[PDB]
Specification:
Chain lengths: 111, 90, 111, 90
């Protein structure tokens, strides 16, 4: 139900081993977290049972990622905050593209 | 020293009258050119994209666009209903 | 060796049935073309045998796509032009994100 | 009526002295603020991103950024070595 995919615009590659923290609005309660794979993807964050309606924030730790590659980051993280499952359960993929001074995110939502 | 600019990728225009709150702090609403001047460590710029889309009658994915960075800075955000990108020019 | 993936930022979905034309620099010679799947992906454009070094242009037909959905497009197409395989064969994925008045593309290149 | 603006997403700055050729037509190189004024159906704006990156000592993926559209227009391009995004504001 919640997938994150991250690409690196500086290296021309997936963004590998990037930390992703998901929080749910209670204050922001920790909900789920993970690290992207060698494909830049993070599956297994959560389950249909755990993924309730509410306001979720996904924070992708772009600062650590760039610092580990030896690159100066501008942002602390790339984030996405969205209301989930309000009219019914859905599946969300958050796709992100990273550069040191810019990031882009989009959502794909399926029923 | 800190400017915010907001653009609409659907209609190809500035995003007018968008609420922008800066934390660490400053706030405003965007002008007819999509810019917010005169707002004024680690800063958060929270752009009320949900109200912008809903005024247009478009269902948007995000609650807001929040951009968090360490500190003359221009923070631009390009909006679509299910995406946003943001840039810093310094 | 050459994959294209396309997402729609207006609908929150893959960009389905979008035409993609690839040309190689001779004038631009037709090289390969296809349409994205229900996942927004286009596999099977070309083969390791056919994919030689050279300058390639990938043109994604964003105008037809938006017109078919009833949306006014600004661009004629989203394009990407790049030198391929110069220091050796590689695999290229071109990922694109579409809005009516904007598009983004990135490349993932693997050996 | 037609402005071009080019920004660098790696260094967080305008892209200075970039060659831009418009077809249908006009050409120029970007200024210290990354803008090209005074350039002046279907138009192509070809931005020489490869020369920009190679002057910085960075190997870039694209040959150029070419943006083709049907026609006051601002065409912005945000550059990274393996990506570019482009916006039209009208
Ligand atoms: O289909 C995909 O895997 C995929 C497609 C496009 C992106 C993408 C492109 C540009 C900006 N942001 C995200 C990311 C992933
Ligand atoms: O200053 C501007 O006009 C301007 C600033 C930023 C962008 C932009 C942002 C994200 C992706 N692509 C382009 C575009 C234009
Ligand atoms: Ca509900
Ligand atoms: Ca060679």
């Amino acid at each position: 139900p919640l997938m994150v995919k991250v690409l690196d615009a500086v290296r021309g590659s997936p963004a590998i081993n990037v930390a992703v923290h998901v929080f749910r609005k209670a204050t922001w309660e920790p909900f789920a977290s993970g690290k992207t794979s060698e494909s830049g993807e993070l599956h297994g964050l959560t389950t249909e049972e755990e993924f309730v309606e509410g306001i979720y924030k996904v924070e992708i730790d772009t600062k650590s990622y760039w610092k580990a590659l030896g690159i100066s980051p501008f942002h602390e993280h790339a984030e996405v905050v969205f209301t989930a499952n309000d009219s019914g359960p859905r599946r969300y993929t958050i796709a992100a593209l990273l550069s040191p001074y810019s990031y882009s995110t989009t959502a794909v939502v399926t029923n």
